Amino acid sequence: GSAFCNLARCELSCRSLGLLGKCIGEECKCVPY
C-alpha cells in the first residue's frame, strides 16, 4: 500500500539482530524462529 515489506530484506534485517523475519500488515516484523 503506502508501504511494502520485502521478506528477503526483512530476513536480512532481522538477521542483524539475531532472529527471523516475517511481513505483517505490509511492514517488517521479526520473530523468535
From Swiss-Prot:
GO CC terms in record: extracellular region
Pfam families associated with the record: Toxin_2 (PF00451)
Segments for region ([R/K]XCQ motif): 8-11
Disulfide topology: 5-23, 10-28, 14-30
Effect of residue 15 to A: 1.45-fold decrease in cell death of Jurkat cells
Keyword check for Glycosyltransferase: no
GO molecular-function term, one example from the UniProt record: ion channel inhibitor activity
Tissues of expression: Expressed by the venom gland.
Post-translational modification Tyrosine amide, affected residues: 33
Localization per Swiss-Prot or TrEMBL: Secreted
Keyword line: Amidation, Calcium-activated potassium channel impairing toxin, Disulfide bond, Ion channel impairing toxin, Neurotoxin, Potassium channel impairing toxin, Secreted, Toxin
Domain characteristics, as noted in the entry: Has the structural arrangement of an alpha-helix connected to a beta-sheet by disulfide bonds (CSalpha/beta).
Record function comment: Blocks small conductance calcium-activated potassium channels. Shows activity on KCa2.2/KCNN2 (IC(50)=0.0243 nM), KCa2.3/KCNN3 (IC(50)=1.7 nM), and KCa2.1/KCNN1 (IC(50)=42 nM). Induces cell death when tested on human T lymphoblastic leukemia Jurkat E6.1 and human breast cancer MDA-MB-231 cell lines which constituvely express KCa2.2/KCNN2, but not on human peripheral blood lymphocytes (which do not express KCa2.2/KCNN2).
Family: Belongs to the short scorpion toxin superfamily. Potassium channel inhibitor family. Alpha-KTx 05 subfamily.
Note: Negative results: does not show inhibition on KCa3.1/KCNN4 at concentrations up to 50 nM.
Protein name: Potassium channel toxin alpha-KTx 5.4
Organism: Hottentotta tamulus
